[PDB]
């Protein structure tokens, strides 16, 4: 949507661990048709963890459902991902990233890196 | 990726208006 995404909150957790990502955009991100995290390793196409619409809904893969909680603070331009009950197989590089309809890839983002070990 | 944000569309496509 022509707006600079930077995520941060990630780190290294023991398995069943927390953490909270955070992504603030340059743009007002309430004016953002659609955004959300995506976890992403090595070999593997960018996983989408969690979507939030501009109206405020929200969607959740399967795996983290009840675990992780999307959010938007558009009052400090903040996306959010509060990662509860971390498993080992939530490790990877975390991305967020947005635009509306019309954009072809959106805005991403460096991204964030979780690691999850026990 | 193209195809990732896609998907991330698609989760919402049902609310254009």
Redesign the interface.
Known sequence: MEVQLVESGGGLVQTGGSLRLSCTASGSIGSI????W?RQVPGT??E?VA?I?R?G?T?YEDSVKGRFTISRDNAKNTLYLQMNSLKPEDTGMYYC???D?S????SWGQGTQVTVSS | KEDAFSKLKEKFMNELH
């Open positions: 048709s659609v955004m959300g995506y196409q960018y989408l979507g619409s109206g809904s969607w990233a947005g635009g309809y954009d072809r890839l959106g």
